[PDB]
Write a protein that binds this ligand. Structure first.
Ligand SMILES: CC1(C)SCN(C(=O)[C@@H](O)[C@H](Cc2ccccc2)NC(=O)COc2c(Cl)cccc2Cl)[C@@H]1C(=O)N[C@H]1c2ccccc2C[C@H]1O
Ligand SMILES: [Cl-]
Ligand SMILES: [Cl-]
Ligand SMILES: [Cl-]
Ligand SMILES: [Cl-]
Lengths: 99, 99
């Protein structure tokens, strides 16, 4: 699909059996989701942006459904104010910026 | 151009006759640039990112070139970790997301 940027590029995602709203974010290296349970192992990580840094849990090899497109990758879980789909998963669904 | 997301979508911008690197950032509502001199009056703005909120200076109707594309709009100036081109100017240069 072609998504215009008049409003926030929000999409419905399926992660860990849960439906969530998430922002397609080209400024984010990684994907970060609000507090939730994910299976398997994790390690602590710090991610930085505007306002500074937050502590997240890093889960690797996680499957997510984005607009019907399944993708696998690392997902960070923590106190993000917005669910964000970052470049690590945006690449996997074939998402580009066009102008 | 078509910009893939395997690396950061970093572009050259021109503001005040100066070349700068900036990030095409679909997750940002607004355009935020690191400390610099801009003409005219500013007004207060608080913007919320991953690590919280920062105060910025809002300058309206600023002439800015982005990857050779001419835009005129609002530029926020403050303690941003990187120059970011948000949706306010991405829409001006006709930028969309495609997959
Ligand atoms: C470093 C940056 C270029 S600065 C802005 N940024 C980004 O990814 C931005 O798109 C960011 C995303 C976001 C949206 C809503 C709430 C909070 C955060 N937005 C912002 O920082 C601020 O955006 C706004 C403005 Cl400018 C005005 C009004 C309202 C808003 Cl939400 C990058 C970043 O934080 N990236 C980090 C990030 C974020 C999420 C997941 C992983 C990572 C790694 C790291 O790369
Ligand atoms: Cl900051
Ligand atoms: Cl990954
Ligand atoms: Cl590709
Ligand atoms: Cl504007």
């Amino acid at each position: 699909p072609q998504i215009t940027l008049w409003k926030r590029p929000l999409v419905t995602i399926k992660i860990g059996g849960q439906l969530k709203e998430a922002l397609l974010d080209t400024g984010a290296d990684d994907t970060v989701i609000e507090e939730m349970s994910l299976p398997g192992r994790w390690k602590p990580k710090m991610i930085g942006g505007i306002g500074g840094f937050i502590k997240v849990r890093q889960y690797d090899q996680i499957i997510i459904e984005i607009c019907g497109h399944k993708a696998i990758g690392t997902v960070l879980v923590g106190p993000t104010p917005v669910n964000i789909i970052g470049r690590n998963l945006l690449t996997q669904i074939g998402c580009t910026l066009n102008f």
